[PDB]
Each structure stands twice: as structure tokens, then as C-alpha cells.
């Protein structure tokens, strides 16, 4: 039952200002002036042919990161001690009104004076800005994004997701209600749930909070290979079209007479892709968004300080002293872990595995060449115009392309049953 | 809905008689209503001895 | 926020029974049988030609005193320990009903038996008489007078008034509301406020309680000369027609751009005329009445025991151990104090002062000759008929015609700003 609302803005990638300029920020306001609407963070494609590119927004992760920046700067305006919302500008941007309804061009009087020297890795507590503190509805409406962002800002890697398993959640007709989700794709199930979170505040142990947790659970357990067509969780299991492909498509399917034995108790952990290729994996990135919403209303276990960079330690609602640790993983590698299990349980033939792996390899290469090249395009620009430096995608290091701890977390997840 | 416009309703810490002129016109405040008497001028004239 | 309701009956002027008889008491019931109606204590004249005389009621103070007696006797009937209201009589008077609705002639059965030997300087606590204790409304309705009386019975002098100054009272639209009083005479403003107090009980810090206090404040500050046409209190100042005249007429006037500097804080004191000529100064005597109403709902600071005669010390709601002291003053003398200030501040010419003083002298003499003569008329009667002795006006001593402490309190009041 969450009570502390704080978020962490993004840090500079070695730049001397938030990694975003005018050209970029302006182009982000897709669905309107509100930086809080969903379609500002995720696009909606009828999937399966995926991978959306843009001149300014190369990948889906590119957008997700960019929004994180836009909010990181702008938000520092009303969060100052004087809590003024439109007296100073940030890159020629200014808030529309107290309730932070929308963003717009700074008034001449404002453009006349210097901009706000926004800093990096800041941690703020909503309850400090009056207007947010007085209206729980408003606060809730916004936090959805704020948390979703900090879940991408705690570490220099990808978007953190939350995996939990507890038979006690299935209490009530919760079971019935899920079956209505059979047949839908993960993407669909997530997008809708995320969109509908801001409608109104909900209870931390309500049919919503629970289902969203169960879905996440189901997805991941399947993604890794623990659950499958012949080892279902109460007959539920996400089936992937063709694992490894450029754009994966998972569908919540049903399978009878192969229910697995789940151990009584409550278990949970945090996961996060570490390989740059997450910027091009819509599901992984949605899964986090969803997790974000979960946080907007429920207080999850703290993330162990030792798993995150200095700057983001001891953040009241998120990172704490001794808590659960983060589990990273390379996308490619996990693919095999996935296969191995399926094959071993007799659902996949050795031959099939070989095909999938071969594809997964082909994909990784493709996705990398791109990311790596766009990266240069950026450095090339930054040198060209040092007064408006930026990043169209969260910075990544060659090291990030390794296996580092995949097997480890693979087992860890499997150990939730 | 512009909460600012409804200050004495949306902000608990605000005294009933608070206005935000001239930057914001509140659309709900405390109004004083009267009821006066407007009589004619009466005069009783007396004579002097 | 008053909680103790007690009053002090009047004392005998050296007589062996309350200073009132039948002839007198009967003639007092002017507006009806109720000794609680206002027009029983004050008459209403369109002012400026003032000084109302009567065969039995020489001055305005004469009436005020007489009522004090009437209530002092009658009230002792229901306030006995048996709390019976119509079994015994007081001078052939008896109460109409339990709720002390009105007074009437005692029934034959009652006239047959001896009257109540009423005593002097008694202090009673309303809450002792059941009917009053059970109905706050009723209690409040009556106390108006009861307090008004004790404010004339605590000392052998004139009617006590309460002067307070505190910028915190002006909080709210209180300011707006006062301006509606501009143009009216003090007499009018007071009479109405007094009349309207009994309508219903009010809160000790409500727009009423506050305004009535402010008016009193304004009046006195002007009466003494501290505030004036060119040294207003938030533009408010009472202007007297022609100070010194037989019957003064003060009007609440407005003056802009001459507002005085008021010191932050809460200050108060009690005043009271000591010169017999108050029995002929409608304002002074109204001001007390008003103060009375103030007491009916709010608990003012206690009056220091050392300022009042023995008999009236340690009276729970009024006099106490260490509190504020009483400030007396001669009417005539104050007139000069008034002038001096005005002249000094350059509002009055030396010439004008000389005229006013000369008048004030002429007045004092006139008013005295009368009071002093009616006094004899009384002693003359008392010797003639020792079985129905009385006093048409509160007894006074030659000493009472002195200056004694005028200058002192003059300064004291001025020291409230």
C-alpha cells in the first residue's frame, strides 16, 4: 500500500546538460501537449512485423528514454523550493498551468532570461509540490509515468520489471476473470492494463493489482521456459509465435491436464535486460511500464542498494538497505536457456532449437549493427553542435553486449515455482 | 478543471475571504448580501413666534 | 467565551430597604410587564435637544438606577434556595411565571402575608435557578440586563465601560461591514446593537462581538481626543457636534489620508465616569449598556479587586485577584484633555478651545444645580414617609465632583494606540 512518492530524474551521459534539445522535445508531443498521455511513450502496431524507426526516434526504447529526459528537465521547474511553475523556462519549454496539464513555448518575457540549469540524477518527492500533495487523484494520475521512468533511471541498463509468484493471489474469482484474457497477445494485455491504470486510484490488493502481477508472472515464467504448453500454471502459459525473431509475439494460451506443482509461499525478484538490444524488444519494455503502474499503487520490496549505482541508493520508496537484488540478462543468451528447458521437457526437438538459435543470432547482429551505428550518428552531431548536445537513445557500452549473469537469473526465476 | 479557479474549495489552508486577483479570477467566493431601507426625506416644519 | 453567569444586586444608600417603593416601581413598567425589554432602561429621543425629565424620573441615569433596584428586589424572590417564584411578594410585586416573563400585583393571599426582607449587595449565580440553567437561550435573553446592572453596581460611581484595541479584530470583511455604520450617530449605533443582542446567543469572537468592541473602542478614543479628523483609526473617527454642550451628538465619520500608526498587540482597560453629571450624559450611559451586552457572551478580563469596594470583590465572572484596574474621570475635566490634543495636533484653534471650555463650564453648573436639588427633594420625602423610603437617582457625594484621576486615565486610554 504505497505511501512514499518519489522519482529519480535521468543523468547526463557525460554531457553537460540533459541529453535532449528543442528539435527532439518538440517532436515528442505526439498525442498533444500533455507529457502524461500514454501514446507519448509507446506506439501501437498490429505487431509481428515490428521495429518502428524514425528519423529522430530510431527505436521504441529511443522514445521511452527521450520522454524520461523531457520529464526530467521540465519537472525541475515546479519542483524548486519556490514551487513556481511558469516563471523560468527549460529549453524554451514552460508548463501550461499549476496542475501541470501540458507543455508549451515559453513566453517572450521568459525567453528573454536564462534557462534553468537542470542537474542530473535528482530525486524528488511529489508530496513537496503542494498541488500534488492535496489531490491524491492528480498525484496518482501522474505517478504512473514518474515511476515508469525511475524504473529506467535507477541503473544504466534497461527497464526493470517485477516478478512475483504466490498462490494466495488467486483467491476469489480472480481465476475466472483471467480466462477472459485467453487469446490476447501480451502486448495487447499490457497496453490496455497500463492505459487503464490512471482511470482512478485502486487498492493495493485488489483484482487489478493482483491480475497485473499474475500476468507479469506468467509472461516471464514463460519467457524463460519454466512454464509451457506441457507445464502450465493453472493451465495458463504464454506461447511465443517464433522465439528469436526480430519482433516476438506472445499469446496467452490454454493447455489442460499439464498443470505444474506450485510451492506454497510468497516469492519475488526483479529482472532487467542488460543487453542494448532491449531498445528493440517491445515486450520487455512494456513489461516494465506495466510494473511501473503496479508501483503507482502498491509498495513493492526495496531493491538492494548494492545492485544499483551510488546516486540511486536509499531512495525511500525504491532502493533501501537490505532488500531484493536485481537480476540482469543478455537477450540472446536467454533464448537458449528458453530452448534448453523446452527441449529437455520434450516440447521442442533438437532440430527446432538449432533453427531458433540460428535465427536469434541473425537477429542480434542486425539489431546491434543498427543501434551501434545510430550511436555514432549522435556523437557526430554532438561534436558538430556543442550547444544543443543530446542522445536519441540511452547510452550503452561494448561491455553491455555480454552474457554477464544470464544463467544466474535464469535459474533464479525458475526457482520461483 | 482548473483547481486554481476554485481556491477556497480545493485548498484547505485558504481562508474563506481569500482572492487571487489580479492574476487569477476565482469562480466561487464569499459574497455579502444586504437589505437596506431607502426612505423619503421627511420634514415637519414649525413656525416661530 | 463566558461560562459564569452571576450578577450583583444594588446596595442601600444607607436606607433600610431597597431604595424604591410602589409608586416608583409601578411607573417603570413602561413598555409592558417585562422588566427585560430594552425600552425599560433607555428612552429614544431624536437627540440634540436632549435631557429628558420626569416627575418621578429626573434624568436618564435616574431610570437606569431605578431599574437596577426593581430587578434587585424582585429577583431575590426566585433566587431563594427553594426557588419558588410566586409564593412571597416584594413590595406587592410578584412574578407572572417560572420563566420570569413579567411582573404583577401580588394576589390577595400573598398581600396578606409579610413581604420579603430583601438584602443589599447580594451576588447570585444564574445557574442556581433551574429554569435558567436548563435553557441557554432564556439565560442569554435575560443576562443582557443582569450584567448591564452589575456594571452599575460594582462601585458607587457611574456605569463601567470596556475599551480594547487589537488589530487582530479587523480580520476578515469586518472592515467592509463597519463602513455601513458611517453616517450614523453613536446613540443610534449603540441602541440598535444593544436591542439586537438578545435575538439569539452569539460566538465570543464573531462579527458581532468584534464590531461592538471596535465601536466602543472608536468612541472612547475619539471622546478623549486620541483619534480625530486628522488622526483616524483606519479612517474611522467619531466627530462630536459641539463638545461640551448639554446633550452631545457624535457621528461616525470618515477621513482619508490621515490614518494613524497602531501598535501590534492586544490592549484593554476599564473606564467609568465618577462625576454625578453622568446621570445626564446619554452616551456615557449607553456605552456601558453596550459593554454589558458584550459580557453576556464573552468573558472579559477580571477587574482588579483593589479597584472596587469590599462587598464586590472575588465575584467569579467579574472581579478577581490580579487583573485590570478601573479608571475614573470627571466629565468636565476630560473635555479639556479632549481639546488640548485637538488643538496641539492643529485641528482646533486656541480661540475655539476657549469657547468650548466656557460652555462646558456653563453646562456642568446647570447639570449640577439640578442633580443636587432633586437630591434634597428625596431626603425631604424620606423623612416625610419613613415606611417607603427611596431614591430617584443613585446617591452621590460632594467629593464625586472632583477631578480625581482624570488626567491619569486620559493618558491611559491614549496609551492604547
Curated annotation (Swiss-Prot), chains A, C:
Keywords: Capsid protein, Inner capsid protein, Virion. Changing residue 187 to V: In strain: Mutant ts447; temperature-sensitive. Changing residue 322 to V: In strain: Mutant ts447; temperature-sensitive. It holds the Pfam family Sigma_1_2. It comes from the Viruses. It is found in: Virion. GO terms for cellular component: viral inner capsid. Interacts with protein mu-NS; in viral inclusions. Inner capsid (core) component. Mutant ts447 is temperature-sensitive. Belongs to the orthoreovirus sigma-1 protein family. This is Inner capsid protein sigma-2. It comes from Reovirus type 3 (strain Dearing). The lineage of its organism: Viruses, Riboviria, Orthornavirae, Duplornaviricota, Resentoviricetes.
Curated annotation (Swiss-Prot), chain B:
It comes from the Viruses. It is found in: Virion. Signal peptide: none annotated. Inner capsid protein that self-assembles to form an icosahedral capsid with a T=2 symmetry, which consists of 120 copies of VP2, with channels at each of its five-fold vertices. This capsid constitutes the innermost concentric layer of the viral mature particle. Displays NTPase, RNA 5'-triphosphatase (RTPase) and RNA helicase activities. Helicase activity might be involved in unwinding or reannealing dsRNA during RNA synthesis. RTPase enzymatic activity represents the first step in RNA capping, which yields a 5'-diphosphorylated plus-strand RNA. Belongs to the orthoreovirus lambda-1 protein family. Homodecamer; each decamer is made up of two conformers of VP2, called VP2A and VP2B. 12 homodecamers assemble to form an icosahedral capsid. Interacts with protein mu-NS; in viral inclusions. This is Inner capsid protein lambda-1. It comes from Reovirus type 3 (strain Dearing) (T3D). The chain holds residues 1227 to 1275 of 1275 of the full protein.
Amino acid at each position: 500500500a504505497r505511501a512514499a512518492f518519489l522519482f529519480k530524474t535521468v543523468g547526463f551521459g557525460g554531457l553537460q546538460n540533459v541529453p535532449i534539445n528543442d528539435e527532439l522535445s518538440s517532436h515528442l508531443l505526439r498525442a498533444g501537449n500533455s507529457p502524461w498521455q500514454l501514446t507519448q511513450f509507446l506506439d501501437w502496431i498490429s505487431l509481428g512485423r515490428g521495429l518502428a524507426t524514425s528519423a529522430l526516434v530510431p527505436t521504441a526504447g529511443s522514445r521511452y528514454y527521450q520522454m524520461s529526459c523531457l520529464l526530467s528537465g521540465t519537472l525541475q521547474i515546479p519542483f524548486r523550493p519556490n514551487h513556481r511553475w511558469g516563471d523560468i523556462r527549460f529549453l524554451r519549454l514552460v508548463w501550461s498551468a499549476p496542475t501541470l496539464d501540458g507543455l508549451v513555448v515559453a513566453p517572450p518575457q521568459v525567453l528573454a532570461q536564462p534557462a534553468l540549469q537542470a542537474q542530473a540524477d535528482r530525486v524528488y518527492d511529489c508530496d513537496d509540490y503542494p498541488f500534488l500533495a492535496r489531490d491524491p487523484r492528480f498525484k496518482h494520475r501522474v505517478y504512473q509515468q514518474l515511476s515508469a521512468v525511475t524504473l529506467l533511471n535507477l541503473t544504466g541498463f534497461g527497464p526493470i520489471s517485477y516478478v512475483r509468484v504466490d498462490e494466495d493471489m488467486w483467491s476469489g474469482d480472480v481465476n475466472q476473470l483471467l480466462m477472459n484474457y485467453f487469446g490476447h497477445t501480451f502486448a495487447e494485455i499490457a497496453y490496455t492494463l497500463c492505459q487503464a491504470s490512471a482511470n482512478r486510484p485502486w487498492e493495493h490488493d485488489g483484482t487489478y493489482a493482483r491480475m497485473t502481477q499474475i500476468i507479469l508472472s506468467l509472461f516471464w515464467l514463460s519467457y524463460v521456459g519454466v512454464i509451457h504448453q506441457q507445464n502450465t500454471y493453472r493451465t495458463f502459459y504464454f506461447q511465443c509465435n517464433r522465439r528469436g525473431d526480430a519482433a516476438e509475439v506472445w499469446i496467452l494460451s490454454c493447455s489442460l491436464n499439464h498443470s505444474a506443482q506450485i510451492r506454497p509461499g510468497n516469492r519475488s525478484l526483479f529482472v532487467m535486460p542488460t543487453s542494448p538490444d532491449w531498445n528493440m524488444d517491445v515486450n520487455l519494455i512494456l513489461s516494465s511500464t506495466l510494473t511501473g503502474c503496479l508501483c503507482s499503487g502498491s509498495q513493492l520490496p526495496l531493491i538492494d542498494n548494492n545492485s544499483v549505482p551510488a546516486v540511486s541508493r536509499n531512495i525511500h520508496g525504491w532502493t533501501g538497505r537490505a532488500g531484493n537484488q536485481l537480476h540482469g540478462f543478455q537477450v540472446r543468451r536467454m533464448v537458449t536457456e528458453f530452448c534448453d528447458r523446452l527441449r529437455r521437457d520434450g516440447v521442442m526437438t533438437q532440430a527446432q532449437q538449432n533453427q531458433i538459435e540460428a535465427l536469434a543470432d541473425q537477429t542480434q547482429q542486425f539489431k546491434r549493427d543498427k543501434l551501434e551505428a545510430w550511436a555514432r550518428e549522435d556523437d557526430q552531431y554532438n561534436q558538430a553542435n556543442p550547444n544543443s548536445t543530446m542522445f536519441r537513445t540511452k547510452p550503452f557500452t561494448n561491455a553491455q553486449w555480454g552474457r554477464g549473469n544470464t544463467g544466474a537469473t535464469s535459474a533464479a526465476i525458475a526457482a520461483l515455482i | 478543471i482548473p483547481v486554481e479557479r476554485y481556491n477556497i474549495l480545493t485548498n484547505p489552508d485558504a481562508p474563506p475571504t481569500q482572492i487571487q486577483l489580479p492574476e487569477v479570477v476565482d469562480l466561487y467566493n464569499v459574497v455579502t448580501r444586504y437589505a437596506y431601507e431607502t426612505p423619503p426625506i421627511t420634514a415637519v416644519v414649525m413656525g416661530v413666534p
